[PDB]
Amino acid sequence: KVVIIGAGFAGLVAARELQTAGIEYEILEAKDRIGGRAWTEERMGRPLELGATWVHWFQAHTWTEIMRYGQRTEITASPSGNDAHWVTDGKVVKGTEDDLDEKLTAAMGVTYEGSEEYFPNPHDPLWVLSDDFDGPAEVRERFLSDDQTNAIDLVKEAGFDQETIDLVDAFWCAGYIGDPYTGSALMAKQWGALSDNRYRVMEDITLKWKLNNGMRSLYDGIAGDLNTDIRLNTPVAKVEHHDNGATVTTESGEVIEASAVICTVPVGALSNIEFSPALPDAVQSVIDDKWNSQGAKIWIKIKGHHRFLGYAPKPAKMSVVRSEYFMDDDTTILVGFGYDNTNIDLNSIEDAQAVINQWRDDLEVVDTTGHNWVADKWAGQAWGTLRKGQFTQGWSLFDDIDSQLFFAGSDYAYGWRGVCVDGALEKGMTTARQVINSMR
Amino acid sequence: KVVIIGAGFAGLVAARELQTAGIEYEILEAKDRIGGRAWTEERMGRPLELGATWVHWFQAHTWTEIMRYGQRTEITASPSGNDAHWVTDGKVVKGTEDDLDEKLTAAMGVTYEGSEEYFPNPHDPLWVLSDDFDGPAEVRERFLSDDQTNAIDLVKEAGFDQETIDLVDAFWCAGYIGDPYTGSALMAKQWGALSDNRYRVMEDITLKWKLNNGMRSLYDGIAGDLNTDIRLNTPVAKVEHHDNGATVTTESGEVIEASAVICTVPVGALSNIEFSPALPDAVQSVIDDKWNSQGAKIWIKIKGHHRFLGYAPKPAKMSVVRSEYFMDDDTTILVGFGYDNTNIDLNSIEDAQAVINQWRDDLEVVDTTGHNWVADKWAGQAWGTLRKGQFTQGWSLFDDISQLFFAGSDYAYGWRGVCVDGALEKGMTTARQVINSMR
Ligand SMILES: Cc1cc2nc3c(=O)[nH]c(=O)nc-3n(C[C@H](O)[C@H](O)[C@H](O)COP(=O)(O)OP(=O)(O)OC[C@H]3O[C@@H](n4cnc5c(N)ncnc54)[C@H](O)[C@@H]3O)c2cc1C
Numbered sequence: 001k002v003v004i005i006g007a008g009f010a011g012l013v014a015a016r017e018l019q020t021a022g023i024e025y026e027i028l029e030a031k032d033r034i035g036g037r038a039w040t041e042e043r044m045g046r047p048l049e050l051g052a053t054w055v056h057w058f059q060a061h062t063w064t065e066i067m068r069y070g071q072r073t074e075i076t077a078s079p080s081g082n083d084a085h086w087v088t089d090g091k092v093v094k095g096t097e098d099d100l101d102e103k104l105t106a107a108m109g110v111t112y113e114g115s116e117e118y119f120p121n122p123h124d125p126l127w128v129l130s131d132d133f134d135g136p137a138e139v140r141e142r143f144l145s146d147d148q149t150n151a152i153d154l155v156k157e158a159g160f161d162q163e164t165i166d167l168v169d170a171f172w173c174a175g176y177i178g179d180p181y182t183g184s185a186l187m188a189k190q191w192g193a194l195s196d197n198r199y200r201v202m203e204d205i206t207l208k209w210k211l212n213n214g215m216r217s218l219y220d221g222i223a224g225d226l227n228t229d230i231r232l233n234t235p236v237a238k239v240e241h242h243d244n245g246a247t248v249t250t251e252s253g254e255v256i257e258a259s260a261v262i263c264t265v266p267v268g269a270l271s272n273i274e275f276s277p278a279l280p281d282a283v284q285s286v287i288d289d290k291w292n293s294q295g296a297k298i299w300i301k302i303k304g305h306h307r308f309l310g311y312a313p314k315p316a317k318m319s320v321v322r323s324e325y326f327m328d329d330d331t332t333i334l335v336g337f338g339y340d341n342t343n344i345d346l347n348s349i350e351d352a353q354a355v356i357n358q359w360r361d362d363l364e365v366v367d368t369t370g371h372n373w374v375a376d377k378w379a380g381q382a383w384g385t386l387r388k389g390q391f392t393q394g395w396s397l398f399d400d401i402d403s404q405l406f407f408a409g410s411d412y413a414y415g416w417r418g419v420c421v422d423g424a425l426e427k428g429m430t431t432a433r434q435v436i437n438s439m440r
Numbered sequence: 441k442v443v444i445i446g447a448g449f450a451g452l453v454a455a456r457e458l459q460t461a462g463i464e465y466e467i468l469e470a471k472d473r474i475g476g477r478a479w480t481e482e483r484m485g486r487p488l489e490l491g492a493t494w495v496h497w498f499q500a501h502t503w504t505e506i507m508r509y510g511q512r513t514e515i516t517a518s519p520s521g522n523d524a525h526w527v528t529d530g531k532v533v534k535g536t537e538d539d540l541d542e543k544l545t546a547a548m549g550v551t552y553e554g555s556e557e558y559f560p561n562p563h564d565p566l567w568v569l570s571d572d573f574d575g576p577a578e579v580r581e582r583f584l585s586d587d588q589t590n591a592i593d594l595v596k597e598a599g600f601d602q603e604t605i606d607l608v609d610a611f612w613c614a615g616y617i618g619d620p621y622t623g624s625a626l627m628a629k630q631w632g633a634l635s636d637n638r639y640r641v642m643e644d645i646t647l648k649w650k651l652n653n654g655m656r657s658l659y660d661g662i663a664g665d666l667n668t669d670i671r672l673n674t675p676v677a678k679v680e681h682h683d684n685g686a687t688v689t690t691e692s693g694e695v696i697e698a699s700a701v702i703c704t705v706p707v708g709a710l711s712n713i714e715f716s717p718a719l720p721d722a723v724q725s726v727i728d729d730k731w732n733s734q735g736a737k738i739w740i741k742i743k744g745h746h747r748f749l750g751y752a753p754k755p756a757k758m759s760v761v762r763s764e765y766f767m768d769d770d771t772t773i774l775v776g777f778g779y780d781n782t783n784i785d786l787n788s789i790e791d792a793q794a795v796i797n798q799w800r801d802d803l804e805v806v807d808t809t810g811h812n813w814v815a816d817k818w819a820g821q822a823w824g825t826l827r828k829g830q831f832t833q834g835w836s837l838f839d840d841i842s843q844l845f846f847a848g849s850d851y852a853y854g855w856r857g858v859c860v861d862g863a864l865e866k867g868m869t870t871a872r873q874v875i876n877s878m879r
C-alpha cells in the first residue's frame with residue numbers, strides 16, 4: 001500500500017521503518033540490485049566501493065546501522081602519512097601529508113567562518129531563515145550572501161597565496177564532486193558545523209574509516225530484515241499524486257494504487273518519471289539545474305607499494321588521489337575523485353596513467369576501474385552537492401509537496417546531506433515517520 | 441515469547457527491534473511507569489528530569505531516536521557564562537566559567553593520556569586485550585595498570601597544584617556519581633576517546649543540550665510504537681534459563697514461559713531476582729561489588745535570577761551545581777550532582793540550603809527536589825560508573841551467559857552507563873543477538 005521507489009539506503013530504511021509500524025509497503029527498484037549509490041563489488045582482486053565508502057561514529061544514522069548489523073569492530077582507517085604532491089603553479093610541489101593538512105586547516109578557518117552563528121544546532125540548517133531566528137539581521141544577510149559565493153572565493157578574498165588557492169581548489173573539486181566554482185559555500189560551512197568546526201574532524205568523518213565488509217553488509221542487512229520481497233527490474237515511469245493517495249505506473253504498464261509514495265529517485269534521474277500533477281515550478285527549477293555533482297570516482301592499481309597523496313586543481317582529470325590498499329602481489333590501489341565525469345574514462349588504463357602522470361612520471365598503472373554514476377540513467381549524479389543558491393532554495397523545497405508524494409533520500413537530509421549514507425538513512429527514516437504520523 | 445524485564449530505554453528499544461523482526465515479546469515492568477532511570481516529571485513548577493537529562497548529535501543511538509520522534513529542533517543548551525565558584529583548601533575561589541574550563545582542559549590532557557593508543561576505535565574498548573592487538577606490550581601493561589588507578593591520581597602525579605586537584609576531584613565526584621577515588625581511570629579515558637579527546641567536546645556531549653519535551657518524548661515515542669501492551673506493576677522475582685528455554689516468575693507467582701529473556705534490571709537491583717542456574721561467579725562478584733554509582737542528583741530552587749556554577753571536592757553534599765532554569769516567579773532552578781546519596785536529603789530545604797552555603801551564604805533556597813535512585817529498590821544505583829578493575833573485569837562479563845541476555849546502558853560498548861545512548865545501543869544489539877539466534 002505505501003509504494004517506495006528505489007532500494008538504496010533511503011528506500012530500504014523507509015521500508016524497515018514502515019514494517020516496524022505495521023504498515024504495508026512495496027519497494028520498486030529499477031536495477032537488478034539493491035544499494036543504489038552504495039555498491040560494494042569485487043574488482044581488481046578485492047571488494048571495492050564503487051560509490052559510498054567512508055563512515056564514522058559521529059554519523060548517528062550510519063553508526064546505528066553499523067552497530068545493528070555487527071560491524072562495530074569491522075572498520076579500518078585509510079592509509080595516512082603518505083608522501084604528498086600538489087599541483088601549485090602548473091608545477092608539482094612535494095611535501096608531507098602533514099604539511100598539506102596544515103595548509104588546508106589554515107584555509108578551513110576562513111571557510112567555516114560564520115558556522116557558529118548559522119548552525120548552533122547543525123541539524124537545523126535553515127534556522128537563520130526561520131521565525132525562531134533571534135540574531136542580528138546582518139547574520140541573515142551574510143547567510144543569504146554565502147549561498148551565492150563559492151568556497152574558493154572565501155579563501156581568495158582572505159589573502160591566501162596561490163599555493164593555498166590551488167590546494168583548496170583541488171579539495172573542493174573532490175568535495176563538491178563537480179566544478180567547485182559553481183557551488184554554494186554554505187554547504188562547506190555546514191560540513192564544518194557537523195564536524196565541530198575542525199578540519200581534522202571533517203576528514204575523520206568523511207574520509208577515514210572504511211567498512212571491511214563493505215556498504216553491502218549494511219544494505220544487505222536492512223534488506224534481509226524486510227518481510228516483503230523487493231521488486232527488482234521494476235522502473236517506475238509515472239506517479240499520479242493527490243491528497244488521499246497516489247497511482248504508480250511501471251515501465252511495463254502495471255498500475256499500482258498506493259496510500260503514499262516515498263520517492264527516493266535522485267534529482268539526476270527524476271526526469272525519467274512523469275509526475276501528475278507536475279511538480280512545483282521551484283522544485284522543477286532544481287531538477288533542471290540539478291545539483292552540484294558532475295564528477296567521478298576512480299580506483300587505480302599501480303605497481304609496487306607506494307604511500308601516495310596527490311592534489312591537483314580544476315580542470316585535472318582527478319583532483320584528489322590517495323593510496324588505499326596495499327595488495328599481496330606488490331601493487332597499490334588508489335582512489336581518486338575528479339570534477340568532470342566526461343573528461344576521464346574510469347576504465348581506460350591510459351586515462352588512469354594520465355591521472356598518475358599529473359604528479360609522478362615514474363609510477364606505472366596496471367589496472368583501473370570505476371562506475372560513471374553521472375552517465376547511469378538511474379542516478380544521473382554522484383553524491384548530491386549544492387550549486388549557488390541551492391542551500392536556501394534547493395534541497396528543502398522537496399519537502400513542500402501538498403499531496404501523498406514524499407521525497408526522501410540523502411540529497412534532502414537536514415544533516416550530512418547528499419555526501420553521506422547518513423543523510424539517506426536519516427531522510428528515509430524520517431519520511432517514513434511522516435507517513436506513519438499521517439496515518440496515525 | 442521473548443520476555444523483556446524492564447521498560448527503561450533498553451527494554452523499550454529491544455521490544456521495538458523484536459517487533460521489526462516479527463518476534464513475539466512482552467515487557468514486564470516492576471513500576472507503575474515506563475522510562476526507568478529516565479524520568480521526566482512535573483516538579484517545582486515545571487517538567488524536570490529526575491534522571492537522564494542531556495543529549496548530543498554525536499551520540500548515534502540517542503540522536504537517531506531524537507530524529508525519529510520529531511525532536512530534531514527541540515533541544516536547548518543549558519545556561520552558560522555563569523559566575524563560577526570553587527572550593528579548594530577549604531576556601532571559596534571566585535572566577536569565570538572560562539577560568540574553570542581552562543583549568544579542567546589542562547587536567548583532561550593528562551587524564552586522557554593513553555586514549556589514542558588504547559581506543560583507535562572508541563567503540564572497541566577492550567581492543568588492547570584482544571588477539572587483534574598488535575601494539576607494544578607496554579601499551580597492554582599500561583592499560584591494565586590504568587584500570588587500577590583513579591582519575592584524580594593521574595592529575596596529582598602530573599604535578600598540578602592543589603587548586604586544580606580540588607577542581608578535578610569535584611568534577612569526578614559528579615562524573616563517577618560516587619567516590620572518584622575508588623573509580624577506574626579507564627572510564628575517563630574512554631569518555632575522552634568518544635569525545636575526540638577534547639574536554640569541550642566531552643562537556644558538549646554530556647552536559648549541554650536538554651530536550652525541550654523531556655526524555656519522556658523519546659521513551660513515550662518508543663512505547664507508542666509497540667503493538668504489545670507493557671505489563672506495569674509486574675516485578676520479576678525469578679528467572680530460569682536452562683537450555684530448554686526459559687521461565688520467568690513474577691512476584692505474584694505467575695509463571696511465564698519464554699524462548700529467551702532480555703534482562704535490563706541494573707546491577708544495583710539484580711539481587712531482587714533469583715537466577716537458576718546461578719549467574720557466573722565473575723558476574724556475581726560485580727553484583728556484590730556493584731558499580732561506581734552511589735551518588736545523587738538534586739534540583740534546588742533559590743530566590744532571584746542567578747547565573748551560578750559551583751564546584752566542591754569530596755565529601756561535599758554536592759560537587760557540581762549549575763543554574764538551569766530562570767523561572768517566571770523570580771526564582772532560579774539549579775541542578776546538582778553529589779558523590780554520596782546518604783549525605784543529602786534531596787527533598788529537604790535545609791540540606792539544599794547547606795549545599796548552596798558551600799559557596800554563597802547570601803542565596804536563599806525556597807524549594808528542592810529529587811529522586812534517590814540508590815535507595816530505589818528497582819535501580820539501586822544512579823548511572824553506572826566503573827570501580828577499579830571493572831573496565832577490564834566488569835561490564836563486559838555480562839555478555840554470553842542459561843540463555844538470559846543482559847541488556848542495559850551499563851553493558852554498552854560506547855557511552856556505557858552514563859548515557860541513554862548506551863541503553864539504546866545495548867537494548868538494540870541484544871535484541872539483534874536474540875534475532876540472530878532465532879534465525
Ligand atoms: C561516488 C560516490 C561516493 C560516495 N562515497 C560516500 C562515502 O564515502 N560515504 C558516505 O557516507 N556516502 C558516500 N556516498 C553517498 C551515498 O552513496 C549516498 O548519499 C546514498 O547512497 C544515497 O542513497 P539514496 O537512497 O538517497 O539514493 P540512491 O542510492 O541513489 O537510491 C535510489 C534508488 O532508486 C533507484 N531508481 C532510480 N530511478 C528509479 C525509477 N524510475 N524507478 C525505480 N527505481 C529507481 C536507483 O537505481 C537506486 O537504487 C557516495 C556517493 C557517490 C556517488
Ligand SMILES: Cc1cc2nc3c(=O)[nH]c(=O)nc-3n(C[C@H](O)[C@H](O)[C@H](O)COP(=O)(O)OP(=O)(O)OC[C@H]3O[C@@H](n4cnc5c(N)ncnc54)[C@H](O)[C@@H]3O)c2cc1C
Nearest residue numbers: 446448450470476477492493494676822823848849859860
Ligand atoms: C541521576 C541520573 C542522571 C542521568 N543523566 C543522564 C543524562 O544527562 N544523559 C544521558 O544520556 N543519560 C543520563 N542518565 C543515564 C540514563 O538514565 C541511563 O543510562 C539509562 O536510562 C538506563 O536505561 P536502562 O534501560 O539500561 O535501565 P533502567 O532505566 O534502569 O531500566 C530498567 C527497568 O527495569 C525495571 N525493573 C527493575 N527491577 C525489575 C524487576 N525485578 N522486575 C521488573 N522490572 C524491573 C526498572 O523499574 C526500570 O524501569 C542519568 C542517570 C541517572 C541515574
